[PDB]
Amino acid sequence: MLKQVEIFTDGSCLGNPGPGGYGAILRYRGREKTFSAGYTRTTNNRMELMAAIVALEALKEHCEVILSTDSQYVRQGITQWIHNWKARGWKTADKKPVKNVDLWQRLDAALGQHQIKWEWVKGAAGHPENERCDELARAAAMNPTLEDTGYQVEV
């Protein structure tokens, strides 16, 4: 049987754009691995994506994953947009690349390596680990050490 891993993820940003960061927790057989990093200039949406990307890429073997996050952006992409973008070559009708294509492509790639059960949560009570991810993400945004290379300035 495959390992069944619990993943909790969250991202945040102080502005649009501004410093931002992510936080993710992987739970397996009582063991826990935490991941967090901050970027000098990015956006909330890119951080929401990165959290999920870093968590999934951290798994070195095919797994059963229970991914819990309150990322609306990730949810919409996963249950709505992802399919179409794969059917249009990751480009808008006007041939212009889809926003954050660099990160969406990395996520999609990570997604196809595991059986994922998504648990869309609502930032409140009953989600201790998610709240923990928020704290990690907020502490990383306040002490950024990385450059979000894939970030392209609006217009």
What does this protein structure show overall?
The structure is a monomer. With 155 residues, this protein is an alpha/beta fold. The protein has one domain: 2-Layer Sandwich (Nucleotidyltransferase, domain 5), CATH 3.30.420.10. It has helices spanning 44-57, 72-87, 101-111, 128-141, and strands at 4-13, 18-28, 31-42, 64-69, 115-120. Strands 3-2-1-4-5 form a 5-stranded mixed β-sheet. Strand 2 (18-28) and strand 3 (31-42) form a beta hairpin.
Briefly characterize the structure.
By secondary structure, the chain is an alpha/beta fold. It has helices at 44-57, 72-87, 101-111, 128-141, and strands at residues 4-13, 18-28, 31-42, 64-69, 115-120.
Return the CATH architecture.
Answer: 2-Layer Sandwich
Shape: globular
Helix amount, in percent?
A: 25-40%
Largest sheet: 5 strands, mixed
Radius of gyration over all CA atoms, rounded = 15 Å
What fraction of the residues are assigned to beta strands by DSSP? 25-35%
Tally of domains: 1
Number of helices: 4
Calculate the terminal CA-CA distance, rounded to whole Å.
48 Å
Widest beta sheet: strand line-up: 3-2-1-4-5
Structural class: alpha/beta
CATH superfamily: Ribonuclease H-like superfamily/Ribonuclease H
Number of strands: 5
CATH topology: Nucleotidyltransferase, domain 5
CATH C-level name? Alpha Beta
Order of helices and strands: EEEHEHHEH
